[model samples]
Target: GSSGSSGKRPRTRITDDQLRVLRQYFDINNSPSEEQIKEMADKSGLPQKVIKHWFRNTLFKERQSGPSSG
Candidate 1:
């Protein structure tokens, strides 16, 4: 049997700079193209996958929170 197969990965800590960049871009474009993702990846110094997931999770949470009114 292979050791360390199918286990949860440790959570990665996002830097404030990265968060700021992500939020700034997200507010304008929630869905970004591949080129855009690469741009953000370079700016944040984070992996492309992480950036993608950040956008995904952020959108999910935004929807989950729902509207303050109604």
Candidate 2:
């Protein structure tokens, strides 16, 4: 039998404080090293994998809305 009915998992909601910390990191550097990401995850109380995903997502968001592109 199949366990999960859906293949995809539900979106994880990020905490306000978590976002604030993530945003701070993104502001300092759009790209983060693995060690830096791990440090962030530890401080923010989010999974390392999830933090990586958020980093990419935020990177895309930043690049797609550059000053000249708009």
Candidate 3:
């Protein structure tokens, strides 16, 4: 029997609980250590790489410019 392998995984959705945990960990420390991130990801059942990627993507760029007033 062959398992189906054509479907793609849905977009990674961060739950409120996960976000809270992530924020709490970040707040208590300056930055999340690799070990800390790995631990959280494991606990949250999210891939460590994905967690790391989200953090990087969220923090990598400067703040967005404000809209120009007419």
Candidate 4:
């Protein structure tokens, strides 16, 4: 597994069903707890780190969408 210490490109595509579930989770809770990540990992059969980064990036994007940091 590639450590997310760098801006690594996505190595694989999430399936439509998996992406839909993940997207739904983010819409309800962008800041998922560790337990939530583990649950998502279990459900999606994806690594915890991958689950972590996916939601983390979503949260970051939402934060960025807020008012400018001027």
Candidate that scores best on TM-score: 1
Q: Candidate 3: what lDDT?
A: 0.73
- lDDT of every model, 2 decimals: 0.83, 0.82, 0.73, 0.76
- Model 2, span 1-70: residue lDDT tens: 6685765645777889898888888878886688888898889888888888888987888678545653
How would you encode candidate 4's per-residue C-alpha lDDT over 22-49 as one tens digit per residue? 7888878776678888888778888877
Q: What is candidate 3's lDDT per residue for 1-70, written digit by digit as tens? A: 5986756647668898787777687558745788988898878877887777666665554344677988
RMSD of each: 6.8, 6.5, 7.6, 7.0
Measured by lDDT, the strongest candidate is: 1
Number of backbone collisions per candidate: 0, 0, 0, 0
Give the alpha carbon lDDT tens digit for every residue of 1-70 in model 1.
8686765756777889888988898878876679989998998888898888888987888778555876
Runs of candidate 4 with Cα error greater than 4 angstroms are: 1-10, 66-70
- As a TM-score, model 3 comes out at 0.59
Per-model TM-score on C-alpha atoms = 0.72, 0.70, 0.59, 0.65
Q: To one decimal, what is the Cα RMSD in angstroms of model 3 from the true structure?
A: 7.6
lDDT of 1 at 29: 86
